[PDB]
Design an enzyme around this catalytic site. Structure first.
Site, PDB file in Angstrom:
ATOM      1  N   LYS A   1     -15.094  -7.485  -9.762  1.00 40.34           N
ATOM      2  CA  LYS A   1     -14.100  -8.182 -10.620  1.00 40.34           C
ATOM      3  C   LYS A   1     -13.475  -9.325  -9.816  1.00 40.34           C
ATOM      4  CE  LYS A   1      -9.990  -7.360 -13.542  1.00 40.34           C
ATOM      5  NZ  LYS A   1     -10.614  -7.746 -14.830  1.00 40.34           N
ATOM      6  N   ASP A   2     -13.150  -9.079  -8.544  1.00 47.10           N
ATOM      7  CA  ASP A   2     -12.576 -10.142  -7.678  1.00 47.10           C
ATOM      8  C   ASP A   2     -13.657 -11.183  -7.373  1.00 47.10           C
ATOM      9  OD1 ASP A   2     -10.353  -8.583  -7.861  1.00 47.10           O
ATOM     10  OD2 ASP A   2     -10.117  -8.235  -5.701  1.00 47.10           O
TER      11      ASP A   2
ATOM     12  N   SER B   1      -0.696  -0.541  -6.199  1.00 48.34           N
ATOM     13  CA  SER B   1      -0.622  -1.651  -7.138  1.00 48.34           C
ATOM     14  C   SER B   1      -0.023  -1.207  -8.467  1.00 48.34           C
ATOM     15  CB  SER B   1      -2.010  -2.246  -7.366  1.00 48.34           C
ATOM     16  OG  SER B   1      -1.952  -3.336  -8.266  1.00 48.34           O
TER      17      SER B   1
ATOM     18  N   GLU C   1       4.291 -34.195  -3.827  1.00 47.86           N
ATOM     19  CA  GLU C   1       3.129 -33.623  -4.488  1.00 47.86           C
ATOM     20  C   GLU C   1       3.575 -32.775  -5.675  1.00 47.86           C
ATOM     21  OE1 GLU C   1       0.551 -34.979  -3.520  1.00 47.86           O
ATOM     22  OE2 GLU C   1      -1.246 -33.729  -3.532  1.00 47.86           O
TER      23      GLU C   1
ATOM     24  N   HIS D   1       0.811  -1.213   0.000  1.00 48.99           N
ATOM     25  CA  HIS D   1       0.000   0.000   0.000  1.00 48.99           C
ATOM     26  C   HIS D   1       0.847   1.267   0.000  1.00 48.99           C
ATOM     27  CE1 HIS D   1      -4.022  -1.901   1.550  1.00 48.99           C
ATOM     28  NE2 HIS D   1      -3.616  -2.398   0.396  1.00 48.99           N
TER      29      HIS D   1
END
Ligand code: HEC
Ligand code: HEM
Ligand code: HEM
Ligand code: HEM
Lengths: 51, 104, 55, 378, 79, 239, 31, 55, 55, 51
Positions: free
Chosen positions: D226-227, D204, D270, D200
């Site tokens: 959107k998320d 972004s 894995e 922050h």
């Protein structure tokens, strides 16, 4: 790194070398004391309780 | 072929391949904005600064809608102007002078 | 007067009524969708599911 | 003034989430941070409900898992969600790292380092969690990975035995791993909070790699939906994995009770560790292999220092773009070979792939960046 | 860091329309599909070749591993 | 040589929305009782788990009461035998692994509760294992206690061919062909491995319909909210 | 200040009812 | 200042002693337990003749 | 809550899991505690504002 | 509480009573639906089938 290539930085390193050595000794002795290495703690005159 | 202008040809090919033409952006608009670029932008004349803000904002708007400026409006390699290069060179030179003084 | 406009004027104007309509629709949709999906799955596997064998 | 600006908790929520200036041109690749947060929340809840019935004893862990899947009502769905949700967590984590590498997001040095620590914590958490079932794969993978620490020159065996809680992997090791697996995800959440806190400060990044202060947008009315859509797609993929192919990404060897005597013919970790596995098989030296694995994971720290290009993003750098996709194909090769056994072609292709992985992000990438800089006459 | 003071932009005017006034799916076939097609065309020749090389390597490796374990006629023929 | 790859059989439940054939599950459970139960154990399957799949509760109780099991200590601290209830698990053929190895020529018959999920190829493998018991190829030899089976990884399995035509009589009356017997056993073993198979398929269908409803709607909501930015036009008007 | 007219948005506008009896309020309510 | 620093140093010495004792106790608690340690070297294998193969 | 008809192993395992999770929730709630305390600052025994003698 | 004892507060309560009733109905129906309360869901048509 290029900016650090100069006489002034060499003088600074020379000034701070004793401090670096003292802190390295602090770290080494602290590690030996914390872990009870006994490889090194056998040489010391006292602290021979690890029979 | 390698007779000098081959370098210019490959540079033109790379410039066209890089997509900032399609967004109507100049090459100096794509530069990463570190401290030197920040000060170079601050030193730009107001008209150049405003032109840059719009070109970038328009590019951001086009990228948001995943669209592309029309082929006619693409920035041309021959026509491109490097407005930030002089200011950036000056800022870098001043910083190098300060560093050289410091190391002395 | 479209059905959507009547619905907006009657139920969608006040958001609390919108939520009430949403919850009632949730109840009825849960019932109907569950019944329909169960019917589809049972029809696909009519001879396999135990329910028919139990009879 | 609205309540958002008055209550300190509302202050934090509004500043960081409701009214956070974010670029408008942000693409779908930035949706994987919220997806990672959702994965973490899902893993925490599902693992809590699983541990409500799980007994971490070597003599009862397998029976407890069988009881969870057979007797506990809706226990199968919970266990499958936890397993396939870990798989989806690593998928999203890999895509997040790929986005950060591609769009020059590593220039947020502190955020990048916090992310590296997060990746390490998640890898350890998943490893111990996979040890938890106490199947054949769990036991033998745990033994291999823990014995990996014997490479340490002076304190190797002492450290390995201390981690084991004994002379070999057994019940004390299983309980240790269960407790660590329980604690670690909360530490991961705290590290993620630090991640967001350091992010922050700068804000972004955007695909163009150009400051977007001109076109900042509030987050609540745009990126929230959107998320949400991204979370819906992620949940769709997860439910497909848990409801139609529950064992697609699993190895049909954790369903045999772990016997410390016989070892399965094909012991592999894995899938999200397979590339790392290949690295170990690549280097003939044991300590060399361990160091190569550590470098394979930690080279992300050296990536920012190797950024020799004048442009943050790669979408304006076709040569670096091709190199990045070559690296991705190399990672796929590493994973596939890690799946495959040790033989004539697989070993040599794996060694070549490991060398290429190390060279591309250490030599080829900076040289291509410098070449591009020259090609742009600046 | 609030929206009030982020940067200085001068005489940049933008026109926006209400979400309800406009349609959620404009130019689906006139612009949308051609736009997606051109994006795919642009990214194809830069993404696909690496994965094609990967697929070739995968197939060759699998076939060679198969060949390695089905061999040795002469090893027993000399007997 | 690496074991032969089992050929994917067209199992009825292999479909996306298919379900296990519960008649086949019942027949496979019968074969497990008659043939498999002598030496293979199912520690994770009780005489319940069958009330809802094939047998009714009363029928399951009658089935469970057939086999007597050891019960907890009564007075005098003595363990006794009990007729057997629903909550009891399937009988264990051998008290411990050592007894199983002693009675099966040093080989341990694996628990069949997870055998389908525990083997590569799943039920498809198991069927092949029960199906292919060819004689040893020219040039291979094995001990008396072992039998050649191409689908077994070592090609030398310690299990004698367990099923053959008319080894047991099905309650339904279907021809007790060894192939039919093997198919029923594999269906039952698949059910034991995945008792939630039918419920998982049902929830998968329901969630597929749910996503088909939701994803276009949520995408439309996102497009509606974002249309303001997606369609906004900007102009630059320097003085 | 006076030459600033909104560019044409007709290509994005919804297919508003052409009945011409539906008032603007009614059309907004429908949408 | 030397007397004050001496007070601080002795306090730090005591704190370090206590901290090492606590940390070593916890770390040793993470080590092998007494019951596990007992069944480590005492056990002695008594092996018969398992034919001519690896057992 | 019991996980059955009486307190038994199900109850103990549930309680163990809740006991494991809850202290971290307590830590986060204590961070909220300190956050809400920070807005006004600590109080003093006199009960009078101490802006004159902050430290 | 003394300050609220006024005619316009009564007017405000009268204005917000329909909103309060609607939210109470929302909460009640949500509680009935989430818990699948048989006692109440045994009266609503077409849901009685599900028992
Ligand atoms: C003692 C008689 C015997 C009976 C009858 C028998 N088994 Fe087995 N089974 C064994 C033994 C012994 C092994 C392991 C042999 C080995 O590992 O070398 C085995 C192995 C298996 C395997 C494969 C395990 C592996 O590692 O591949 C399956 C599957 C299986 N049993 C299920 C069955 C089924 C289905 C039947 C059908 C009635 C059956 N058993 C009947 C003794 C028997
Ligand atoms: C549990 C693990 C993680 C969580 C919860 C997490 C969370 C987030 C979130 C929510 C964002 C917001 C922006 C976005 O969504 O893209 C973000 C950004 C970022 N993350 Fe992480 N992350 C994790 C792991 C990582 C890893 C493994 C790395 C790198 C190796 C990393 C590096 C970054 C960077 C560089 C950004 C900046 C985004 C930008 O530039 O716009 N993170 N993270
Ligand atoms: C960082 C997030 C987490 C990841 C990536 C993760 C990963 C895993 C994985 C891969 C398994 C093995 C699944 C299997 O093969 O069956 C597992 C099992 C388990 N996890 Fe987690 N886990 C996470 C968080 C948690 C949390 C917070 C708990 C809290 C108790 C937990 C408890 C368990 C338990 C009890 C098991 C054993 C049951 C099982 O195998 O499904 N996990 N975890
Ligand atoms: C895990 C439990 C708790 C923790 C960790 C915690 C933590 C703290 C801390 C560190 C302070 C700073 C001031 C001081 O230390 O006196 C504080 C202040 C305060 N706490 Fe808590 N507390 C807890 C429980 C409680 C409880 C149970 C109450 C009330 C029933 C409470 C009410 C307060 C109040 C009113 C203050 C203000 C002090 C002042 O104005 O000077 N706290 N708390």
């Amino acid at each position: 790194v290029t900016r650090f290539l100069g006489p002034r930085y060499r003088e600074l390193v020379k000034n701070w070398v004793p401090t670096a050595y003292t802190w390295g000794a602090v770290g080494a002795v602290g590690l030996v004391w914390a872990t009870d290495w006994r490889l090194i703690l056998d040489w010391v005159p006292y602290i021979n309780g690890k029979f | 072929s390698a007779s000098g202008k081959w370098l210019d040809g490959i540079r033109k090919w790379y410039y066209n391949a890089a997509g900032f033409n399609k967004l109507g952006l100049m090459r100096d608009d794509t530069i990463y904005e570190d401290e030197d670029v920040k000060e170079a932008i601050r030193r730009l004349p107001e008209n150049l600064y405003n032109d840059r803000m719009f070109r970038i904002k328009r590019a951001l708007d086009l990228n948001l809608k995943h669209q592309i400026l029309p082929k006619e409006q693409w920035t041309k390699y021959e026509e491109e102007n490097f407005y930030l290069e002089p200011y950036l060179k000056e800022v870098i030179r001043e910083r190098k002078e300060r560093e050289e003084w410091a190391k002395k | 007067a479209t059905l959507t406009s009547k619905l907006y004027s009657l139920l969608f104007r006040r958001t609390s009524t919108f939520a009430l309509t949403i919850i009632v629709g949730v109840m009825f949709f849960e019932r109907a969708f569950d019944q329909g999906a169960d019917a589809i799955y049972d029809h696909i596997n009519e001879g396999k599911l135990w329910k028919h064998i139990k009879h | 003034t609205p309540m958002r600006k008055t209550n300190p908790l509302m202050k934090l929520i509004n500043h960081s989430f409701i009214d956070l200036p974010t670029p408008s041109n942000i693409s779908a690749w930035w949706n994987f941070g919220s997806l990672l947060g959702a994965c973490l929340i899902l893993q925490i809840t599902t693992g809590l409900f699983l541990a409500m019935h799980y007994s971490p004893d070597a003599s009862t862990a397998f029976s407890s898992i069988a009881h969870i899947t057979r007797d506990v009502n809706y226990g199968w769905i919970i266990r499958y969600l936890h397993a396939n949700g870990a798989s989806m967590f690593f998928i999203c984590l890999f895509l997040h790292i790929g986005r950060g590498l591609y769009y020059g997001s590593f220039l947020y040095s502190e955020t990048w380092n916090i992310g590296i620590i997060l990746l390490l914590a998640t890898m350890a958490t998943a490893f111990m969690g996979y040890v938890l079932p106490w199947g054949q794969m769990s036991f033998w993978g745990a033994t291999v990975i823990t014995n990996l620490l014997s490479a340490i020159p002076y304190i190797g065996t002492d450290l390995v035995q201390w981690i084991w809680g004994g002379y070999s992997v057994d019940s004390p090791t299983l309980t240790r791993f269960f407790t660590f697996h329980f604690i670690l995800p909360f530490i991961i959440a705290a590290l993620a909070t630090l991640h967001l806190l350091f992010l922050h400060e700068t804000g972004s990044n955007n695909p163009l790699g150009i400051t977007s202060h001109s076109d900042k947008i509030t987050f609540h009315p745009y990126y929230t939906i959107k998320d949400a859509l991204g979370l819906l797609l992620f949940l769709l993929s997860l439910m497909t994995l848990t409801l139609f192919s529950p064992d697609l990404l699993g190895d049909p060897d954790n369903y045999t009770l772990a016997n410390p005597l016989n070892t399965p013919p094909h012991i592999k970790p894995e899938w999200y560790f397979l590339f790392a596995y290949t690295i170990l098989r690549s280097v003939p030296n044991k300590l060399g292999g361990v160091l190569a694995l550590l470098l394979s994971i930690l080279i992300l720290a050296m990536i920012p220092i190797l950024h020799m290009s004048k442009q943050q993003s790669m979408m304006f750098r076709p040569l670096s773009q091709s190199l990045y996709w070559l690296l991705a194909a190399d990672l796929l090769i590493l994973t596939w070979i890690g799946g495959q056994p040790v033989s004539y072609p697989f070993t040599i292709i794996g060694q070549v792939a490991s060398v290429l992985y190390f060279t591309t992000i250490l030599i080829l990438m900076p040289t291509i960046s410098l070449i591009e800089n020259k090609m742009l006459k600046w | 860091r609030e929206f009030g003071n982020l940067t200085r932009m001068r005489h940049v005017i933008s026109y926006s329309l209400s979400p309800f006034e406009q349609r959620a799916y404009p130019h689906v076939f006139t612009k949308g599909i051609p736009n997606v097609l051109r994006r795919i065309r642009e990214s194809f020749f830069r993404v696909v070749p690496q994965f094609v090389v990967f697929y070739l390597i995968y197939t060759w490796g699998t076939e060679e591993f198969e060949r390695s374990k089905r061999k040795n006629p002469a090893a027993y023929e000399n007997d | 040589d690496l074991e032969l790859h089992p050929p994917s059989y067209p199992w009825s439940h292999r479909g996306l929305l298919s379900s296990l054939d519960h008649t086949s599950i019942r027949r496979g459970f019968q074969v497990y009782k008659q043939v498999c139960a002598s030496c293979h154990s199912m520690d994770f399957v009780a005489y319940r788990h069958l009330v809802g799949v094939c047998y009714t509760e009363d029928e399951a109780k009658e089935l469970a009461a057939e086999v007597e099991v050891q019960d907890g200590p009564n007075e005098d601290g003595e363990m006794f035998m009990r007729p057997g209830k629903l909550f009891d698990y399937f009988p264990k053929p051998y008290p411990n692994s050592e007894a199983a190895r002693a009675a099966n020529n040093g080989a341990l018959p694996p628990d069949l509760s997870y055998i389908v999920r525990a083997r590569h190829g799943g039920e498809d493998y198991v069927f092949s294992l029960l199906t292919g018991y060819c004689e040893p190829p020219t040039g291979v030899s094995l001990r008396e206690g072992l039998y050649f089976n191409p689908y077994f990884p070592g090609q030398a399995i310690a299990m004698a061919p367990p099923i053959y035509t008319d080894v047991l009589e099905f309650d339904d009356g279907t021809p007790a062909t060894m192939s039919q017997i093997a198919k029923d056993v594999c269906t039952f073993l698949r059910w034991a491995s995945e008792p939630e198979h039918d419920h998982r398929k049902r929830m998968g269908l329901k969630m597929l319909m749910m996503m088909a409803l939701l994803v276009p709607l949520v995408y439309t909501i996102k497009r509606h909210k974002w249309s303001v930015l997606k369609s906004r036009k900007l102009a630059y008007r320097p003085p | 200040h006076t030459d600033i007219k909104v560019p044409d948005f007709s290509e994005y506008r919804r297919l508003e009812v052409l009945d011409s009896t539906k008032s603007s309020r009614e059309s907004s309510e429908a949408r | 200042k030397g007397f004050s620093y001496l007070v601080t140093g002795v306090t730090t010495v005591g704190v370090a002693y206590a901290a090492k004792n606590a940390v070593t106790q916890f770390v040793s608690s993470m080590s092998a337990s007494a019951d596990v340690l007992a069944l480590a070297k005492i056990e002695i294998k008594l092996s018969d003749i398992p034919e001519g193969k690896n057992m």
